[PDB]
Amino acid sequence: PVETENIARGKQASQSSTAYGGAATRAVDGNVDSDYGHHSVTHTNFEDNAWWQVDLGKTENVGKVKLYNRGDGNVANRLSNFDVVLLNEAKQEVARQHFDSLNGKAELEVFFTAKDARYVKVELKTKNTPLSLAEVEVFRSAT
Ligand SMILES: C[C@@H]1O[C@H](O)[C@@H](O)[C@H](O)[C@@H]1O
Ligand SMILES: [Ca+2]
Ligand code: NI
């Protein structure tokens, strides 16, 4: 049971690198449109262990992180073999979940057990592959 407010929206975002103009802030712009050509999907270099991060700006009790995959050009499978990580204000890991695949689905819902975190990170574990996210949404645990 989570709150409805997407607390990642408009927050400071960063990523390992930026390519094809795929600014990290596109994942927190309030637009889940997954077509790259519509300018709301991020893109890093083709590199090893690409990552993307949002800073929630303070410590929040997180219950759910929802990822929206890229949908055009059939390169959806680049979001595979990845971690979703929650960090504290000191940037130490407080939670981590591993996923093989989204299995063709446009989105993934990730449920955390009432974790107090300031940062949310997506980390690819794969070589020479870019990280592209249409959107990352984060919701507080319902109190
Ligand atoms: C933005 C570009 O989109 C194309 O469809 C891909 O083939 C390229 O690899 C790159 O990701
Ligand atoms: Ca977006
Ligand atoms: Ni179009």
Domain boundaries, the chain: 1-143
- Ligand 1 atom at shortest distance from the alpha carbon of 22: 1
Ligand 1 centroid to residue 130 C-alpha, Å: 10
Nearest CA to ligand 1 atom 6: 73
* Tokens encoding 85: 């990580």
Tokens of 73: 């050009």
User: Which residue owns the Cα nearest ligand 1 atom 10?
Assistant: 20
First to last CA, the chain: 9
- What is the experimental resolution, given in Å to one decimal place? 1.9
CA angle at 126 for the pair 132 and 119, rounded to the nearest 5°:
55
Q: Is 55 annotated as a binding residue?
A: yes
Q: What is the dihedral of CA 26, 29, 30, 34, to 10 degrees?
A: -10
Distances (CA, A) of 83 to 11, 90, 92, 126, 142: 21, 19, 15, 11, 24
Q: Is 143 helix (H, G, I), strand (E, B) or coil?
A: coil
CATH class of the 1-143 domain in this structure: mainly beta
Q: What is the spatial distance between Cα 98 and Cα 102, in angstroms, rounded to a whole number? A: 11
| Residue 114 and residue 63 in contact, taking contact as beta carbons nearer than 8 Å | yes
Closest residue to atom 5 of ligand 1, CA basis:
73
Nearest to 56 by CA among 7, 113, 5, 115: 7
Structure-determination technique:
X-ray
**Selection from 141, 83, 143 nearest residue 111 by Cα:** 141
How many Cα atoms within 13 Å fall on the side-chain side of residue 8? 30
Is residue 31 part of an annotated ligand binding site? yes
Which atom of ligand 1 approaches the CA of 19 most closely? 1
Pocket of ligand 1 (CB under 6 A): 20, 36, 43, 73, 75
